[PDB]
Amino acid sequence: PMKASLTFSLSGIYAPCSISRDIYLEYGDKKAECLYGTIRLPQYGPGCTPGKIVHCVLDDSLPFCSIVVPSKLFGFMPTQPTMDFCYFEPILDNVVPVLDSVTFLINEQLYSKLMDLPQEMQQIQFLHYKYNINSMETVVHSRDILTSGLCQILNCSPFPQGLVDFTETQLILVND
């Protein structure tokens, strides 16, 4: 794990993380569109945030040792500042797993929208237009709050985080 200076993006929970070129160099020959890492934030006193897997993309314009991460990935969104670095670890030997199912807890308005679609394949495609969930690319995580009061991931299976295969992963929708 390396320490990297941290900037929080405010453009959706599933915006990819941007990493500086020195971090990108740690992956070597890996395919530049398929990069993942684990992020943990430092916490009040001992210990740190639990490891969260994210898709990362090179941003050549960032200064050294820098990452940009969505603030919505973590407990609260910054209305006042907090901590100026994170612990970042590239994923090198491993690949990221595909979920068998994802369960969304959604408000009545969104549920009706999803329910006026007779097909499951277009239910995930609809969430893909609303939220930048991309098949076999975006990592989703249990308890992710996509929009306060509208949409939250209740659970994933068999792992608490992983990729969504639009043709394979099962979508479970729960009215709130």
Author numbering: 0 to 175
Verbatim from the authors:
Pex1 and Pex6 belong to a family of type 2 ATPases associated with diverse cellular activities (AAA)-ATPases that form hexameric complexes consisting of two stacked ATPase rings, D1 and D2, topped by N-terminal domains. Unlike these better-studied homohexameric AAA-ATPases, Pex1 and Pex6 form a heterohexameric ATPase with alternating Pex1 and Pex6 subunits.
To structurally characterize the Pex6 N1 domain, we first used limited proteolysis to determine the boundary of the domain to be amino acids 1 to 184. We recombinantly expressed and crystallized Pex6 1-184 and collected X-ray diffraction data to a resolution of 1.9 Å. We then used molecular replacement with an AlphaFold atomic model to determine the structure of the Pex6 N1 domain. The Pex6 N1-domain consists of two subdomains: a double-psi β barrel in the N-terminal half (N1a) followed by an α/ β roll subdomain (N1b). An X-ray crystal structure of the isolated N1 domain from yeast Pex6 showed that despite limited conservation of primary sequence, this domain shares the conserved structure of the NSF and Cdc48 N terminal domains. The Pex6 N1 domain surface is largely hydrophilic and has a negatively charged surface in the N1a subdomain and positively charged patch in the N1b subdomain. The atomic models derived from the crystal structure of the isolated Pex6 N1 domain aligned very well with the atomic model based on the cryo-EM map (RMSD 1.604). The biggest differences in the models were related to the loops with high B-factors in the crystal structure, which form the interface of the N1 domain with the N2 domain of Pex6.
